[PDB]
């Protein structure tokens, strides 16, 4: 039951990072590569940081999950202009996971 529950999520989780639209999200964003990204984004969330928290054992419901991979998006819907490849990502993806949490019957 608690098992189950991280079965889905790490199956979810990695089909999420292996979709070719996941690259902007895979690790936390470098200060490098975008100066100043860590004064505007407060909640900063990324694939890697999920995985860990996953491996954690934090995940103990589908909102925490949910709320986790719905930041990774909103962060950059905030952060970007909506015709950037970083916003067209993120839409992308975005139809991908809500398709594998239906596929999966996962639910509160
Ligand atoms: C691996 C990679 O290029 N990650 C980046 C680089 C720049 C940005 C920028 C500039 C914005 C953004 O929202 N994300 C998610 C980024 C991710």
């Known amino acids: 039951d608690p098992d189950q529950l991280y079965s889905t999520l790490k199956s979810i989780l990695q ?3 292996s979709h070719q639209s996941a690259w902007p999200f ?3 964003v470098k200060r490098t590569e975008a100066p100043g990204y860590y004064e505007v984004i407060r909640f900063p ?3 890697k940081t999920m995985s860990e928290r996953l491996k954690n054992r934090y995940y103990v419901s ?9 930041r990774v998006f909103t962060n950059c819907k ?9 916003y067209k990502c993120a839409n992308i993806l975005e139809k991908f996971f809500f398709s594998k949490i239906k596929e999966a019957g996962l639910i509160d």
């Open 15 to 17: 089909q999420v990072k």
């Open 26 to 28: 895979m690790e936390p």
């Open 45 to 47: 969330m990324d694939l």
């Open 62 to 70: 589908k909102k925490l999950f949910m709320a986790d991979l719905q």
């Open 78 to 86: 905030e952060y970007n202009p909506p015709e950037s490849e970083y």
